[PDB]
Design a binder for this molecule. Structure first.
Ligand SMILES: CC(=O)N[C@H]1[C@H]([C@H](O)[C@H](O)CO)O[C@@](O[C@H]2[C@@H](O)[C@@H](CO)O[C@@H](O[C@H]3[C@H](O)[C@@H](O)[C@@H](O)O[C@@H]3CO)[C@@H]2O)(C(=O)O)C[C@@H]1O
Length: 623
């Protein structure tokens, strides 16, 4: 928890009681575990919805949906049962509540099971299953001098009549909400991302939405890949962004502009960025994923555990901030090495909160954290993004001012700031590591075997913010060569392996004063010419499996070659700059590199020309 932040145990395992109703009697009953947090704001009333697992944290056991609500931002709370299960057997349960706030209403979607002790995706059919929607109406009152609220929960209604028996290529089995908090779209539709099974026991995600305040429901025609569960969605620039759990794999993220009729993997931004464990080979998790406006900027907040422990332990709940370009790790929200899987982040009245799980020995509580320090960090980072974008956008570029320098898709920028071992991203998300470097205005001067800088791509590890580069990127830099090399030496490039020896796209320079652009593993043809001590502007672009190399705004002869040779998607290890930064590679690049920009798309000709013409205006030095 960041400085100034704090928490309390709000739903306290084996301690907190809830009003358990059975056969007309209500009794305050102790709950073993509380899971499945969903924290929302209903026009001033904070509401925390969760599972109340009465007897055990085992999934297939007696569970009702509990709600705690507060009109004083979490200082005090009232408790109720929002949805009771069928009471059919000792393991009857309403499960994985998924919440949408609209007006003064809470719409809560839960699966319902009567007697199965088996995990839901193992069921061969839906004999034990129903899908229920309950609506809580929140009413406020200023009775007695102080603010009060109450929530009246309606009886649950089954939505099973809206579930078709067939979908493309399949027979349906069951579905559940994706857990946590869903949305109202800008057109008013209630939108639940749902996880669905078929009769082959495959799981996949869909959009399940209502145009009439929840009276009827429809499925979008499209779907995610099989294997995608617990989807969580937000709306961004007219599209739904659907972020999915993939057990034992990297999280897939999709975009849909048509209420789920068509799904496109978000390969250029967020898909495959987040891994469920250090080696992305462990179970995944539910994630909070919301779009909020902080100091005038629309951004997304995302949480997921790092899960160093593995299996379902899911320690180290982390918070992430992104503007759909840059992806910043705000930090760890949970404390130390506690197990802390599911979470829900709420931004209300310019204050940030998180309701999340803590698990010791499979006994779960929900803690309620005030994210004071985290909001401070977020605001600072957003200020930096806004300030650098404004700086670049406002430069009067050379002819009357010509086209503005583009900041659309600008993800990272290495310029004047550097420490002894790192070249600092102006956007504060991903620094490059360095060796044998000396600080110069707006960049670094490198020399010697092992020299250079490494801007990690897959080397970022569990969370890969630059995964987009495997699909498209532009890498831009100003360079000056100080010594004619003995053979061919590297200057800039994207490497597929850790050494730099297997390149996707790169630029080297040689002893006959020629450039050596490298297109994948294609034979290298030297071309053009450069002069020692003269500064040049370099652009590397890749999109649609084609790589190009520009020197001083102009493509080298023969550029625009295929660099992705087959069906496999590249897995770039890193960008290398000014050398390989590998003592094991015997090359000695003696060069200065300044102002390295990374974009998540292939820049157009005008944008490249503008960067070339403005290369001496973009640096961070004076600031
Ligand atoms: C309806 C439902 O079950 N929802 C829970 C989901 C799903 O089970 C999951 O997405 C698979 O469909 O996941 C959560 O529950 C898991 C949690 O209870 C852990 C606690 O250790 O156990 C997981 O089951 C494991 C079990 O631990 C293993 O020993 C072995 O039996 O495999 C099962 C695989 O299911 C539960 O899946 C979750 O926390 O991830 C929570 C939802 O309530």
């Amino acid at each position: 928890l960041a400085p100034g932040s704090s928490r309390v145990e709000l739903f306290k395992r084996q301690s907190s009681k809830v009003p358990f109703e059975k056969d007309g009697k209500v009794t305050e009953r102790v709950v073993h575990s509380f899971r499945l947090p969903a924290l929302v704001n209903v026009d001033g009333v904070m509401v925390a919805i969760a599972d109340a697992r009465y007897e055990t944290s085992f999934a297939n056991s007696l569970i009702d949906t509990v709600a705690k609500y507060s009109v004083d931002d979490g200082e005090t709370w009232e408790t109720q049962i929002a949805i009771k299960n069928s009471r059919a057997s000792s393991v009857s349960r309403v499960v994985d509540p998924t919440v949408i706030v609209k007006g003064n209403k809470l719409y809560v979607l839960v699966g319902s099971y009567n007697s199965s002790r088996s995990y839901w995706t193992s069921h061969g059919d839906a004999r034990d299953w129903d899908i229920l929607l309950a609506v809580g109406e929140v009413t406020k009152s200023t009775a007695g001098g102080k603010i009060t609220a109450s929530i009246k929960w309606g009886s649950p209604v089954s939505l099973k009549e809206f579930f078709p028996a067939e979908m493309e290529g399949m027979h349906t089995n069951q579905f559940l909400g994706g857990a946590g908090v869903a949305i109202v779209a800008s057109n008013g539709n209630l939108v639940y991302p749902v996880q669905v099974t078929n009769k082959k026991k495959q799981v996949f995600s869909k959009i399940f939405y209502s145009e009439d305040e929840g009276k009827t429901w429809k499925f979008g025609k499209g779907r995610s890949a099989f294997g995608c569960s617990e989807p969580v969605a937000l709306e961004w620039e007219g599209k739904l962004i659907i972020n999915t759990r993939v057990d034992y794999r990297r999280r897939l993220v999709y975009e849909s502009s048509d209420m789920g009729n068509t799904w496109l993997e978000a390969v250029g931004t967020l898909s495959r960025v987040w891994g469920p464990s250090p080696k992305s080979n462990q179970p995944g998790s539910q994630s909070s994923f919301t779009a909020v406006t902080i100091e005038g900027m629309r951004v997304m907040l995302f949480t997921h555990p790092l899960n160093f422990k593995g299996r379902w332990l899911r320690d180290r709940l982390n918070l992430w901030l992104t503007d759909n370009q840059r992806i910043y790790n705000v930090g760890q929200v949970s404390i130390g090495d506690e197990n802390s899987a599911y979470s829900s982040v709420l931004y209300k009245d310019d204050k940030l909160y998180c309701l999340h799980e803590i698990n010791s020995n499979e006994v779960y509580s929900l803690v309620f954290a005030r994210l004071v320090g985290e909001l401070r960090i977020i605001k600072s980072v957003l200020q930096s993004w806004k300030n650098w974008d404004s700086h670049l956008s406002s430069i009067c570029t050379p002819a009357g001012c010509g086209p503005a320098v583009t900041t659309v898709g600008l993800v990272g920028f290495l310029s004047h700031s550097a420490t002894k071992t790192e070249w600092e991203d102006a956007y504060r998300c991903v620094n490059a590591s360095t060796a044998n470097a000396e600080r110069v205005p707006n960049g670094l001067k490198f020399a010697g075997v092992g020299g250079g800088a490494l801007w990690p791509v897959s080397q970022q590890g569990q969370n890969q913010r630059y995964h987009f580069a495997n699909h498209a990127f532009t890498l831009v830099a100003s360079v000056t060569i100080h010594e004619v090399p003995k053979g061919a030496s590297p200057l800039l490039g994207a490497s597929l392996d850790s050494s730099g020896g297997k390149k996707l796209l790169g630029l080297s320079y040689d002893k006959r004063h020629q450039w050596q652009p490298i297109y994948g593993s294609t034979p290298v043809t030297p071309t053009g010419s450069w002069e020692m001590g003269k500064r040049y502007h370099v652009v590397l672009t890749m999109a649609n499996k084609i790589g190009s190399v520009y020197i001083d705004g102009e493509p080298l002869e023969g550029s625009g070659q295929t660099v992705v040779p087959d069906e496999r998607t590249p897995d770039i290890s890193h960008f290398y700059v000014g050398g390989y930064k590998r003592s094991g590679m015997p090359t000695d690049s003696r060069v200065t590199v300044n102002n390295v920009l990374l974009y998540n798309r292939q820049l157009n000709a005008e944008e490249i020309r503008t960067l070339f013409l403005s290369q001496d205006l973009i640096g961070t030095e004076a600031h």
